[PDB]
C-alpha cells in the first residue's frame, strides 16, 4: 500500500503551523490525503503541534459525525471503525479493497472537513501582537502572558529577541507606558519590573492624582 | 543484566537540579539512560524531586506515544508494556536480548526525549529572585509565597537566611518599601509585618493622598 | 522492524528549523535517530526544508566519508551501500542483525554527525534582521532583497506584516532614511519605492551636494 | 477511457493565466484532474504558457518526489514510471485497474501538489506594474525591459497601448522624468530616447549641479 | 604490520594546523610518515583539515608524477597504484616485501614532498590579522570577510571574541573608523552597523565634501 509519505505529513504540518486555521487549509488537507486510510487520517491529525483547543473541537465533531453515524447505520463499519479509534489498518484496507467497496477513508475524510470548516468558521488565532496590557493589570503578570506567547510563538531566536525588545515596551498601558519610557532604553526586564511594580498602588495612584490636581489648578 | 547504578541515579538527579530544564538536561540524559532497561528509565524519571508540573507533562507525553503505539501497531510489546507500567522485568529483558530484538528501552528513550524536549521548549524555571509583589498584594501573603519558595529552592541554610535579609525588602512594592526602609534594619519579620499591615487600607490611602495634596500645595 | 515515527521526524524537522543550525542540533540527532537504519537517516536528512547550502555541504561531507571508507575498507557493504544510495532496506536490516553485526547504521549516523559538526562550525544563518540597504544599493533591489527573505522566514502572517511595517523603513539606509521619515507613516510600498526611485541619480547627488554646501556657507 | 476534455484544459490553463501562482489554484487544480491518468496530469503541466522559473521549479520538485519513491520503494512502476516519462498510458490505466489498484495518478497529483505548494509559497508574479527605472539606469534599456515585459504580459493591443502611453513616462526616474514632463505629451518614444540620452553623461550632470549651486548660491 | 599510530597522525596534523604551511612541514612529514604505506600517506593528506588549496595543488602535483610515472614506465605497480587510488594495502605489503622490493611508499612519498615544497614555495596563509576594509567597500561586507575568516580561525572562543572587539574596529577604513570611534566603546555591532551603513553614498560624500571645503574657506 501508498500510504502518507513523510514528506506530505510534513507538508501538512508546515501549512497548518504557517497558515494557522485560515481557509486555505481546508483544500490542501484533500489534497495531501486523497486516497488516504483513516488510520493514515489520524496520523495526519495527531502530528498537529499547538492549536489544542481546535483538535480538541475537530476530535468533538468527529465523535458527533460517528454518533449519527451509529444512530442512521445499524462486517459492516461503526462510527468508530471509519474514525480509525477501534479499527486495525487491514481491516481498513480490505474495507477499501472488498466488491463493493466502502469507503471509510473517505467518510473520515468528509468529517475531518466538516470539523475543519467548523473550525475555519469560528477560530480565532492567538499571537505575540495580540498580548497587550489591561489598564488594571500588573505589569508582571503582562510579562508573563507575553513571555508564555512568545515561548509558543513560531520564530527563530533572533527574531523572539527583536520581538521583546519591541512589543513587551510597545504594548503596554500608558500608566506603565510612561514609566518605561522615562527609564532609559539600556534598562533590563528587571529593571523594567522593579519601575513597573509600583504602578498600581495607593503611592502611584496618590501621586498621578495630585500631578493632575496640581496642573489643572495651575492651569486655572 | 546490568542495570542502573547508584552513582548513576545521583548524578542524574543532580544534573536535573543544577540545570533545572535547561536544553542541556537533554543530551546528559542519553549520556546516562542509553542501553537502560524501560524499568531503569522508570526509576531515572521518579527519582527526581520537584518539577511537578513538568513531571505532569512528561508522563502525559509517553501516554499520547503510548497511544500511538497502540493504534499504529496491533507477545508482542503495547505500549504500556514499553512504557513498563504494566511490564516486568523478565519478559522486558527478553524483549530486549530476543531474536530478532525488539528495542523496547530505544522507544522509551525516544518517547522522553520527546517530553523533554517539549518541556524545554515550552517550560519557564522558578526561582526566588523571580518572587515579588504585587501593587495591590497584601505584605503578608508576599511573605507567604517568599517563604514558600524558599523553602521549596535547595540552597545551604545559611544562603536561605542571607536571601531572607537581602530579598524580601529589596522585591517589594515602592509602597511597601518607604515603610520597610523608614524601619531600622535590626525590625526582625513580625515587626515588619505589623508596620506593614496597613499598607492598602483606608488609612494608609488617605494618609498618601494627603502628602501628596501637601506636596502640590507647597510646590505652587 | 519498528522503522522511525511520524512525530519522531516532525520533532526533528521542527528542531532543525527552530534552532536553524546550533549546537543543540547534533544532541537532538543523536537522541531522535539513535537505533535507526540508513534509509530512516536519509529521510531525516532529505525531509529537512531550507537550508539548501547546509544541506549540500553535509551531502559532501558524507560522500568524503564514503570515499575514505571504500578507500580503506576492500555482501560485504560499500560507502554507497552504508549511505543508503545503493542499498535497500532488507540488505540494512540484514547486516545490522547479522552474525557479527555490521552497524551500517551507526557508521551512518557517525558520518551525518562529522557533517552536522563542520555546518554547525561554519554556519552563519540568514534572518530578515540582517537585511540591510546597502550605501549604494537601489532601494527597489533592497525592498525584494527584503520580501525574498521575508517569503523564506519561518513566521506567521501578522508577525511578516509587522516585519514589513518596521524594518523595511528600520534598516534602509540614510539617503533613503530620509525620504522615507519626510514621506510619513501613511506612505504606501509604492509611494515609498517612488519617493526613492532617484537616489544616487544626478538630481539627488545634486541636490545633497548644494544642500551640504549651502549649510557650509550659511556657517561661515 | 474518459480522458481530460480540451474545456478542462482550457479552464486550467486560462486559471493559471488569470489567477498567476496564488493559492486558488491547488483547489482548482486538484477539482480539474480529479481522477486524470499521469499523461493526462503531463498535459496539463505542460500546456501552462509563460512561468518557465515556475515550471522549472516544479519539474525539480517533481524529480526529488520520484527519487524519493525510488529510494524508498525497491510491472513494480517507478518514480518515473508515477511521473509519466517512462510510462504509456495503456500501462498506467491497467495500474489504475489493477487487483489491488495502484492509485500511480493519485501519487503524482499529490507531488504535482506539492510543487505547487512550493511554488505559491515562494514565488513572485512580475507584471508591467513592477517595471521602475533605476536611479542610474539608462532610459534606453528601461524602454527595453517595459517593452519586454509589456510582450509577455497577457493583455490586448488597445490596452497594451494605453500602459505603454501612461505607466513608461509614469514609472521613469525623476532625472529622466523631470525631461519627460518638459518636452510634452505630443512627444513620441523616438524624441523621449533622443532628449534622454544625456541623463548620466557628464553634461548633464554639470548642468544639474550648475542648478542646484545656482539655487543655493540665490537663496543666500 | 605497523600501520600508523593516531598519535602520530594527531602531531601530524597539530603540526599542520599550527606552522599552516611554513619550510618546518617538510622535515616533521619525513619524519612521521618515514616507512609508511601509500594508504597511510593518503590518510594523513587526506586528514588535514582547512587549507582546501593547498590540498588541491598537492593532489594535482600527485597527480602530475604520477602521470610522469605511467608516461616513463612501461603485478607492475602503476602510478595511480604508488598514489594508492587503485592499489590496495595488500598490494602495497606485497610490493614492499617482494625481492627485490619495490618502494612504492617511498615513491609516494617523494611525490608529496614535491607537492610540499611547491606550496611552500608559492602558498601565502590568510589569517585575521590580514582582514582590513577597502577604501570603498561596504562596512557591511568587511563584517561579513571579518566574522568567515574569524570563524575558520583556530583559536579559542574568548580570544575570537577580544579579537572582535580589537581587530574589527582597527582594520576598517578611515572613513568608517571616524564614525566608529565618534560611537564610542559601548557600541555594539548592530549599532556600529547602522552608523557606517551611510559611507560611500551621496549624503556622506556631500557631508565630508562639505567638511572639506569649510576648513579650506576658514583657512582661507
Ligand atoms: C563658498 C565659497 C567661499 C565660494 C564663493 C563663491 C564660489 C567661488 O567664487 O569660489 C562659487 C564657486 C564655488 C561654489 C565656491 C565654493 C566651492 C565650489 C566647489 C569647489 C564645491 C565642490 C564641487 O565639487 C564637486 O562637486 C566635485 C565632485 C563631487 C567630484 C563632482 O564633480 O560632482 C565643485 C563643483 C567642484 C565646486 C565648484 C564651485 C565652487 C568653486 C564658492
Not at 492549536?51 to 453515524?69: D, G, R, V, Y
Request: glycine content about 6%; overall charge negative; some cysteine.
Amino acid at each position: 500500500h501508498q500510504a502518507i509519505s513523510p514528506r506530505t505529513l510534513n507538508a501538512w504540518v508546515k501549512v497548518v503551523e504557517e497558515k494557522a486555521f485560515s481557509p486555505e487549509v481546508i483544500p490542501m488537507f484533500s489534497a495531501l490525503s486523497e486516497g488516504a486510510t483513516p488510520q493514515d487520517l489520524n496520523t495526519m491529525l495527531n502530528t498537529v503541534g499547538g492549536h489544542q483547543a481546535a483538535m480538541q473541537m475537530l476530535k468533538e465533531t468527529i465523535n458527533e459525525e460517528a454518533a449519527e453515524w451509529d444512530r442512521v447505520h445499524p462486517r459492516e463499519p461503526r462510527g468508530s471503525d471509519i474514525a480509525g479509534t477501534t479499527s486495525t489498518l487491514q481491516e481498513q484496507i480490505g474495507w477499501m479493497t472488498n466488491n463493493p467497496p466502502i469507503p471509510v477513508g473517505e467518510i473520515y475524510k468528509r468529517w475531518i472537513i466538516l470539523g475543519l470548516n467548523k473550525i475555519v468558521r469560528m477560530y480565532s488565532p492567538t499571537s505575540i501582537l495580540d498580548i497587550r496590557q489591561g489598564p488594571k493589570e500588573p505589569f508582571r503578570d503582562y510579562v508573563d502572558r507575553f513571555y508564555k506567547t512568545l515561548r509558543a510563538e513560531q520564530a527563530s531566536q533572533e527574531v523572539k529577541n527583536w520581538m521583546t525588545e519591541t512589543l513587551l515596551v510597545q504594548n503596554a498601558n500608558p500608566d506603565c507606558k510612561t514609566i518605561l519610557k522615562a527609564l532609559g532604553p539600556a534598562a533590563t526586564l528587571e529593571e523594567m519590573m522593579t519601575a513597573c511594580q509600583g504602578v498600581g498602588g495607593p503611592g502611584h495612584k496618590a501621586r498621578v492624582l495630585a500631578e493632575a490636581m496640581s496642573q489643572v489648578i495651575n492651569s486655572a
